[PDB]
Structure 1
């Protein structure tokens, strides 16, 4: 089997991407944030504290003939941005782009933090990291991908995120029309539960490539590119007037700037992030200070190849017995 679903930016900055997902019988379609940096499939629901729901579409398990309470199971998750959610668990039929999993754990939110409430466009998350990170207790649950894997034509999924445009998540096949050149594969460590890999270096603009190992995670659920302070300083030093602002919470730059590209290494291959992808616009409405899309990972504890990086590539998440990651230009 295979699946193919379009993923759409939630706003004009590509802050996140939503993908329609069918849950239950008859289908209830919710728009979920596919997150390769976490491993819970959770939704706004009929159980979510009413004051914490503001425009989201909810899953109502009592209206699904295939929903079953997973008795005694609870979940609770905290994300890197400080947001959180928790609740109980149902199993139900879940379909993505025509690919169906029966008995998928669907984590129903009883509580969500303010950042989730305030984002009316995101009805929940669909985790695509390794199932060892799943938070369900006392019986840990599998991700949608883990459950689907045995049925797939090939044990893979691909992320093809757009810059200010829709893109695609495919399951079970590699669309050879969706990228240019060849795919370069690189080793993955699953020790922390992430799609963790080592970039071979970077360049700023038309500058020389610096060969240096940068361990980080491929994380579709993080907006920006978070890299070591040395790398980030070297980038922003090429932008007149750019500075790190503790008051704003990162590097800012004059909105009048033209940003240089940023290149990262995948083995001997190179992925180029155009400068425009690094512009996250005014820090506040009408400001002439703009927020940068490359930020320091110092104090996160991990480097993160978020959407800024991933949307410059066609990315293969290879879930074979020995997982690997592939990157191609597009």
Structure 2
């Protein structure tokens, strides 16, 4: 592990507080893509030009055309990434990728199959896994791992900043610091919690409480920080409990409450690493109205991650929006500091 004296930031655009993506360049000349940086997975893919136009998701997204890159290097091994919400498939390809000014030779997947649901709802073109190599499908080396290998980053860590406001443009949707963290988006001190098992940004969850009582997971559970997840999530069971206390009316893909009821919803604290990270209703309730005739969805819902990783709580944007997060690959730890 060689540490340099560099840092690199990636400006992120905030889409409806559910999607945060930056741009990256691939091939020569560079072909730009909108990608979400996902600590949940570990691979890199962008929709490929060799993707049938019968997949409408490919018709609506930028497509990488290896035939246009002079730096491209063929591989072709079949690849499939099975996320808990959708799946993509294609083949491995190598080319130069430019991220935050940094340039690195990277092996990535060219997707030739992306189902309309959920990808037609994706404002980004692809993903950049920030997970560990151990979880990389096809044993493909994670982009960050390769970067670290250049011996230029200051620390074997990267931080995430997600802005609340999604509507303003003049402001920055978010920021990722490769090689450290940015003191301008957090205040106070960082409080760490080591990873449980290596190869996964997952940690011990000593309990989730909904306001008054500690009505959830008294025996403990795990929380996986997914900077590529729109919301916070618990096992279908746990959430039926958590919502019950909120009085949310469960629907097909989420829970809602009458808009008037929104403000008077109780806080929700996650006990992590010996600290209570509490959220107020305003932090997990898409207000958007105050009428009792209207419905307002919650930035929280059920999602059961299959084993070996699951079951587990997933802390996504809804959590990172309030708590600036540092990922420490050096000490298998995750720091949480109050965003600013």
Normalising to structure 2: TM-score of the pair? Answer: 0.83
Could you tell me how far 1:262 is from its partner in structure 2? 2.1
CA distance in 2, matches of 1:160, 1:187: 20
Q: Compared with structure 1, are the counterparts of its residues 299 and 91 closer, same or farther at alpha carbon in structure 2 (3 Å cutoff)? A: closer
CA distance in 2, matches of 1:177, 1:105: 33
Q: Compared with structure 1, are the counterparts of its residues 185 and 36 closer, same or farther at alpha carbon in structure 2 (3 Å cutoff)? A: same
| Aligned with 1:310 (options 314, 320, 329) | 320
1:99 aligns with 2:102: yes
Answer whether contact 2:325 2:337 (CA < 8 A) is retained.
yes
SS in 1 for 2:59: coil
1:324 aligns with 2:333: yes
SS in 2 for 1:315: strand
Runs of 4+ aligned structure 1 residues displaced above 6 Å come to: 208-211
Answer whether contact 1:55 1:120 (CA < 8 A) is retained.
no
SS in 1 for 2:186: coil
| Aligned with 2:281 (options 272, 275, 286) | 275
CA distance in 2, matches of 1:208, 1:181: 28
State the Cα deviation string for residues 251-306 of structure 1 (Å, max 9, x = none): 32112222333222232333233322322478xxxx82332222245575222112
CA distance in 1, matches of 2:304, 2:47: 33
Partner of 2:112: 110
Q: Count the aligned residue pairs.
A: 313
Partner of 2:170: none
Could you tell me how far 1:162 is from its partner in structure 2? 1.7
Could you tell me how far 1:33 is from its partner in structure 2? 1.4
SS in 1 for 2:148: helix
Could you tell me how far 1:64 is from its partner in structure 2? 1.4
1:254 aligns with 2:258: yes
SS in 1 for 2:88: strand
Q: Compared with structure 1, are the counterparts of its residues 324 and 112 closer, same or farther at alpha carbon in structure 2 (3 Å cutoff)? A: same
Q: Which runs of 5+ in 1 are unaligned?
A: none
Partner of 2:161: 160
Q: Tell which deviates more after alignment, 157-166 or 29-38.
A: 157-166
Q: Tell which deviates more after alignment, 267-276 or 308-317.
A: 267-276
Q: Tell which deviates more after alignment, 28-37 or 304-313.
A: 304-313
SS in 1 for 2:187: coil
> Pairwise mapping of residues 2-17 of structure 1 onto structure 2 (< 5 A)?
2-10=7-15, 12=16, 14-17=17-20
Partner of 1:226: 233
Could you tell me how far 1:237 is from its partner in structure 2? 4.4
RMSD: 2.5
CA distance in 1, matches of 2:254, 2:318: 15
Q: Compared with structure 1, are the counterparts of its residues 124 and 324 closer, same or farther at alpha carbon in structure 2 (3 Å cutoff)? A: same
CA distance in 2, matches of 1:119, 1:231: 27
| Aligned with 1:73 (options 71, 77, 83) | 77
SS in 2 for 1:183: strand
Partner of 2:208: 202
Q: Which runs of 5+ in 2 are unaligned?
A: 1-5, 167-172
State the Cα deviation string for residues 212-241 of structure 1 (Å, max 9, x = none): 6331211122212112567645643454x5
Normalising to structure 1: TM-score of the pair? Answer: 0.85
Answer whether contact 1:178 1:314 (CA < 8 A) is retained.
yes
SS in 2 for 1:226: strand
SS in 1 for 2:54: helix
